[PDB]
Design a binder for this molecule. Sequence first.
Ligand SMILES: [Cu+2]
Ligand SMILES: [Cu+2]
Ligand SMILES: [Cu+2]
Ligand SMILES: [Cu+2]
Ligand SMILES: [Cu+2]
Ligand SMILES: [Cu+2]
Lengths: 331, 331, 331
Amino acid sequence: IAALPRQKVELVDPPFVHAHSQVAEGGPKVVEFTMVIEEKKIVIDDAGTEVHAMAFNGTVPGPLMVVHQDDYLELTLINPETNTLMHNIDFHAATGALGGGGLTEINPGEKTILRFKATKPGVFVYHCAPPGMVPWHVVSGMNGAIMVLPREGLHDGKGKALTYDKIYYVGEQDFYVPRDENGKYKKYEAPGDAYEDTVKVMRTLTPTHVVFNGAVGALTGDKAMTAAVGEKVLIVHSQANRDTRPHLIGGHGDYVWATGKFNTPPDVDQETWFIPGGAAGAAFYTFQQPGIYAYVNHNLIEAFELGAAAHFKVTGEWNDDLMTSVLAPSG
Amino acid sequence: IAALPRQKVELVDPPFVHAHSQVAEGGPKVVEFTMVIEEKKIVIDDAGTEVHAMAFNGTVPGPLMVVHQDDYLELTLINPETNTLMHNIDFHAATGALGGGGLTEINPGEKTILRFKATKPGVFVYHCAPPGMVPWHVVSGMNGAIMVLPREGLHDGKGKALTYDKIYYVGEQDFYVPRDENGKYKKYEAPGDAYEDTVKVMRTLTPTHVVFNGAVGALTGDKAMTAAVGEKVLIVHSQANRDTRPHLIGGHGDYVWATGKFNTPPDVDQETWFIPGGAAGAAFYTFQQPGIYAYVNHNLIEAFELGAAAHFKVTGEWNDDLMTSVLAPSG
Amino acid sequence: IAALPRQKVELVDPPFVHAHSQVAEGGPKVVEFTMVIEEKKIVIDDAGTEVHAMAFNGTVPGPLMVVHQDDYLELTLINPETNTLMHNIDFHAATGALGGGGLTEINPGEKTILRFKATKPGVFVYHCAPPGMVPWHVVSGMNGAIMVLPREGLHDGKGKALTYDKIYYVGEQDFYVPRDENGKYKKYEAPGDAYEDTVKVMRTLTPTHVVFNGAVGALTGDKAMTAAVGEKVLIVHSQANRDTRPHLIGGHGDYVWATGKFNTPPDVDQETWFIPGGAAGAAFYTFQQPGIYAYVNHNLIEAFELGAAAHFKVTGEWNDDLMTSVLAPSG
Ligand SMILES: [Cu+2]
Ligand SMILES: [Cu+2]
Ligand SMILES: [Cu+2]
Ligand SMILES: [Cu+2]
Ligand SMILES: [Cu+2]
Ligand SMILES: [Cu+2]
């Protein structure tokens, strides 16, 4: 492995993904990533509701990491001195020691380096899982995903290559914010102060917010993801704790690896797919019509009342053969 | 498209389906449908619980429309002056303008005509989706399904054609009825009056009723579906807002397009299948034994406490080889 | 049929499975099983919470029965005079009379014998279903699963035989235990006394406990399942009433018949699979690394707060190629 070429990769904040090649450029290499854990307060809605996030690289969700099958992913995880809690990381893509969790427990002021072989292709969830406080770290936003591309890039069930023009990473988070006796969300001066209260809400299994990329409207308006008619887009989606049912309003999932494993053939022409909590999935789509599209968790209450809605702004020419207003709304 | 043949279809109330041919007769055509939206109070159980439904063509679910791949569906949607709300329609089978929702917003007293090419084969959900009040209209019964059949009819995963003798459309609905101080269901003069309270229930993500065809027991008793031993039946099921897990008690789902897409090979020998909220699915089965069968959502609490149960009354001869009581209940 | 060989099989309590051959050793035979129903009080957590269980063979879940496709399963069901309720059994594997539910309704002091032909291969759920009290009996622990193996044993997508060295049956149960005004779980003298209170909790659709093998921690520590590096393990998992998303922390599901049906090709390299309420599924995995593994329901709140977590204790040598701590947690 010492003789294997190494390469440092720079991570970019979601929904964007760091530079990479779909088809493996050469042979197996050791790909290096460094992430710093940041315990920070984040405002998740327009009412000012705060959540003491625990974030990888400072964002919720943590960045998407990309390697190819059989490469080695080497991660330098750092838990700064300014943090108050112990943290670790669990890659569902790895094999052994609880996905690496048993080998990466670092307290504030510590760091560690873990190397694992990306033996299985597909998109996988990764997240913090500290013994005794596993769900809390996860629902505080401490999770992300990694994509392990096949050496020869993406393909459909029947062997045809699927090359994408754009890739977006949508991380869905369920938050459980405690309320005081008047229905007002509470605020705390430190992460640990919220624990006891958060656990009570978690047990009801009913989130107060379900958001994409850390906040209500995070990916809407001018933060909308963009594409153009004719462009091929791969949308990676993950949920480390609760189920979701993604749906592109106005579009479809031409090829969907709902389970997120590339060795399992993709479902085609999907209207709404399902991604169970603890997994990541991927949908490939070629836009045919311009305009705005809403990407949502299709439990519409979760999408429109809880916050799970994002936008796609597509430029191009309308196709009247596909759809047309024969008679505009008139009396 | 004007040179294409056109055909008007008269819709039938669920669980029945309007006459259609499985194999597309000739070439593409423009299939025309007309639906009138009706805001009406419906009683959903024996206790007299009422809901202010928003019903396509007056029923919950709305009727099933059947077209073939590459046909054009031309829908004339009418929102009567007697209605108090604006409505529209989003077809999951359509490409562009939020499934047609952006092009069909009509106020009471208005009408519009939309046309789209049915490009992908499968069963799809259609529902109302007015900006700012999407979940409210959907959970008020404003949803249904469309079936876009392959021009050569259905086929199993490996070519064998699958021809059904009967087709039933079971639309499943999650309702959120507000309760008063005594735990009794509230009643309002108009739909608008129910909004705030309904919204509070919706946010708990817990429905008060989960019904088939608009009411608890709507498809039991003499309204039970019928078949005969040897009959091939296709059961289309849809849930526009939340997940469901259909199961035929005493039977199986021989071929199940759980995602509802015909270009995706069906699963076979299914005991219980899953349909994510915002999608429709289809299960094909050939009856082997006579008697009553219960068709339910297999979270038995939703099925027997909340209302998600229907019956099948099948005639024919008992097959002792398949099953027999060796010793009837005795001392 | 009458000339068919008969065979009495002695059942063992889960997670263990009675003796069987993966490849059918002869032609069809009538496999005979006997189960006694026991209504008993069980403690489901470390806080002494009691539940009046209704258990097939005295366990929660009921034992796993293994037969081969086209064999006949003849079950003798006994409901002792000491019991207080009528019970029956519904096999999702059977065809007719509600899975046998309509032919096996026995009052305390009665027995019955049912025979059915196991026509479809896969793992299926079986549960009690007394008309008008279906959910209550099922959520009181009265369910299990049966495995109908293909005559030629298990196979992957392209006819490659998959032979397991070990098999474990994890039965997951959702309990709904009432609480008094003080938030303390309630205890009852007889099962029937708990009915009214239990049903009001069931309607919230939120379980108080979600356990594996009848109790929190039932398969952890000294009761952890065992395997070694190199062994191929088949894990059968069932949930008769509610969805679950199994995940082996530190491992994967190399082959997963998520739907539990062997005629439906398995998904591969799964990180987390989904089993809808009312079905059984099976995952095949070959251990590569030693140590402890946690097998959980991946909604981590249900796993670590509600009780749905088990362990695997694996012996063998560590593979540093797959994973290695490059720099142990340091300053
Ligand atoms: Cu952490
Ligand atoms: Cu995990
Ligand atoms: Cu509407
Ligand atoms: Cu929709
Ligand atoms: Cu029972
Ligand atoms: Cu059942």
